[PDB]
Amino acid sequence: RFLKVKNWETDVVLTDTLHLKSTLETGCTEHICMGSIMLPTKDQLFPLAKEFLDQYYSSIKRFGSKAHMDRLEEVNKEIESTSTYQLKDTELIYGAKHAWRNASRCVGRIQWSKLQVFDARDCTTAHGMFNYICNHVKYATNKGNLRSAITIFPQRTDGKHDFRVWNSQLIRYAGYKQPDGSTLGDPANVQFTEICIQQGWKAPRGRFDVLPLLLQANGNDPELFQIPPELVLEVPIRHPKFDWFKDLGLKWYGLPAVSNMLLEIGGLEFSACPFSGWYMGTEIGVRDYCDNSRYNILEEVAKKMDLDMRKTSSLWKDQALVEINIAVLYSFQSDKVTIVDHHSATESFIKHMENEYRCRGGCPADWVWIVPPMSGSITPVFHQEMLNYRLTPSFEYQPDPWNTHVW
Amino acid sequence: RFLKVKNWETDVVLTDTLHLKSTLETGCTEHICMGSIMLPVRTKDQLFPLAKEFLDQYYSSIKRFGSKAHMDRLEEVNKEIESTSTYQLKDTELIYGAKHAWRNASRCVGRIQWSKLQVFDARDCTTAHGMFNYICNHVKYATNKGNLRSAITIFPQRTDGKHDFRVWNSQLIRYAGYKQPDGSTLGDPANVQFTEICIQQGWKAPRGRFDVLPLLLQANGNDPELFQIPPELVLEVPIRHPKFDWFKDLGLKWYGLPAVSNMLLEIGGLEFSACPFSGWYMGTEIGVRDYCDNSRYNILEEVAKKMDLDMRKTSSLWKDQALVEINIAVLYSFQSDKVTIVDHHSATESFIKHMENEYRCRGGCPADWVWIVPPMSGSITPVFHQEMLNYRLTPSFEYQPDPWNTHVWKG
Ligand code: HEM
Ligand code: HEM
Ligand SMILES: Cc1cc(N)nc(CCc2cncc(CCCN(C)C)c2)c1
Ligand SMILES: Cc1cc(N)nc(CCc2cncc(CCCN(C)C)c2)c1
Ligand SMILES: C[C@H](O)[C@H](O)[C@H]1CNc2nc(N)[nH]c(=O)c2N1
Ligand SMILES: C[C@H](O)[C@H](O)[C@H]1CNc2nc(N)[nH]c(=O)c2N1
Ligand SMILES: [Zn+2]
Q1: Which residues bind (6R)-L-erythro-5,6,7,8-tetrahydrobiopterin (chain A)?
Q2: Distance in Å, alpha carbon of A294 to nearest chain B alpha carbon
């Protein structure tokens, strides 16, 4: 019931007690592990509020205080009267930071307590949402010196007045099916692009077209807005050794900003809560550029390198992969846009884990997501046993709104 | 009940029904996943259902389920269990059981080969000397002058747990490791403890960087005995690089035969505590783990120096760059010497086809994503994008305690 995790490189053993506070389910059972699966009322609400408010008041060393009891008292009355309750600014900020702290798939959590929280609970229209998001984007970008941020829109009420950002990330590139049968742009975004066009977006039909925002306020029909082009910082990709690399015409955006997840705090649900940090290079260099279902550039780079592509065992794919990831890091660094390489980031996470075990009794981590998509075992996280479990406040997946929306 | 897995690269969705046959625990609960944890004397009462489950599976596989031959065999085993408290497998059942333990091994990416396994029945073995002879024969057969053949040798099953056969070596072929008084390590740092045991048992250590360890062999619960595998039976490959002529001067080599000898084979409730098995190497096992783990030969720095990479900051990816070259060299070297080896692209591609075939014809394929995905270049192999279900089927290979921690010394 008290669990040990071992690092097989260092022999360091940590003891996890924090897992005994998990509430949400994993998907696994005693008979089957689903560790590699990507997507596995007043009565209900008050214990959730209490559990959260208890952890909040413990965090500021006023557990069992009159102010603690008074708050609990106040929230219980508000739930009985109004069926929901409103978080204090202090609680909203605490909850947001802790949702990130609890994000088991995030390698960047050493940064968790440094999060700028934008309270957008006063927002009422899609135009309001657009303004808030532009300001988030500009703040977080900070001319290349990225700062972590989250913007939090009004909480779900009856579920018929949800605020949603229809985009999965604030900044993504369009994807288009060609008559030629090929795909132009980002293939992962063909469907969403179709929806934008359907809603009246005039698509430029290029390879790196920043998608417009599709914003839904108060359960109303989503509306289209274009992020000011000057607020979208992009980096052209070149290589320090290969002069030809620039000729590939590759670029990527500087701001990684997830916009499709649900923030749960104290049983309240924030269905629109875009958040952003800064990139780890492999995200772009390995996944965005080299996934066969994405920009899929391996072959073209390998040819430019004149590698022997006849046999898998020449490791031409692996060689081209490294160079692509070298180019990504070099380009961001040259343009002074914050980026972290997978060695530095995973080393940070190990230190974070050790801090968390030492001061919190554990750190929920998903090894399948934490280990980088290249060079796994030369990063320290590969050798680190991790326990995965769900704590609240949390960021959760939610259904894509076009399957949900009654137009 | 039906469970679906999806491949996120291809959108191929498979449906698992085989998991309904799973028995042992995973380590996970509804509240915690232990998917990245490495390591998460039977009564007759528990033995017959296990024997019967196995025999039913065996007779189904040969299309004789419910036959008189099937029923007579259940009867025969029941009587043997009630009479002698255990039972003996037929040779056909032993071979079936061993192939299926491999087929069921969720951490093994090489399972497309499972039906092709040479099974050496060593159940008539009685002494450590006898074990040595069987193991030499396995090494020679499996090696086959570089054209490797999968094989397993099966020593007598556990009885009262006080007469266990054990191979104390975790693998049949490994290099010695020596801890120096200055704290540095010579040879393979992973094998320091076991090397010390061997020396204590009387092994004369040459004290070099690549000394093949002797076999330490325990028969019938007796104290283990040392034997040196004939050097001419141990195939090794000097490592060189096709473009970098200095790579040979790193002085690296490795053995051709990967052979696990510390696992327990369970078939029909019987426990085979000494069952060494071997296949052929996937390149990354040597090039990534053996050579580049910080806790092993740890050659990344020296290699990157010789390539004159920028080692001042990690973001030059000098480690990744050197890592690829080392792995090219291992593959090049084995191929040049005509010793069987498979690259991680070939092996994972073959695994995906195996896995799909298993879903179609068997209703599933238990797989541990954490072990299946190679230790370099993960997401440019197809297994990275493949959702897997991990569960445990028998016959199976299991971990067991290291013998030095549990052995009662006779003296
Ligand atoms: C500041 C530097 C940060 C770094 C280096 C970082 C790194 C990463 C990486 C590499 C991933 C995997 C993404 C993928 O493979 O799709 C990830 C996932 C995630 N991150 Fe972080 N992140 C950072 C900031 C943040 C912030 C500010 C938050 C929340 C406020 C956050 C919450 C999450 C969540 C919930 C996931 C899982 C997303 C999903 O399931 O798709 N991260 N992070
Ligand atoms: C024939 C070619 C084979 C290939 C290419 C192959 C490949 C692999 C690889 C790469 C691993 C991971 C090794 C590690 O990281 O320590 C592994 C593990 C494993 N293999 Fe296979 N293997 C082969 C044959 C076999 C055979 C013949 C058996 C048994 C009859 C077997 C059973 C297992 C088991 C039980 C594991 C898990 C070992 C552990 O938990 O330490 N494999 N295999
Ligand atoms: C907060 C945060 C930080 C970070 N380093 N990465 C992310 C991921 C952001 C991201 C941006 N564009 C595109 C994607 C694609 C993700 C699709 N995955 C889920 C298959 C993801 C988020
Ligand atoms: C049957 C089989 C096939 C294969 N390709 N690899 C193996 C593993 C072989 C192997 C050989 N020497 C040493 C090791 C060390 C493994 C260390 N792990 C368990 C921590 C492993 C076994
Ligand atoms: C099937 C498997 O879970 C899937 O491919 C996962 C693996 N690990 C990952 N890890 C990260 N960080 N991001 C991902 O999208 C994935 N994809
Ligand atoms: C902690 C983690 O489970 C451990 O380092 C695992 C990861 N995956 C692995 N995969 C293989 N094939 N072999 C290994 O030894 C490991 N080690
Ligand atoms: Zn699990």
Answers
A1: 36, 368-369, 382
A2: 9
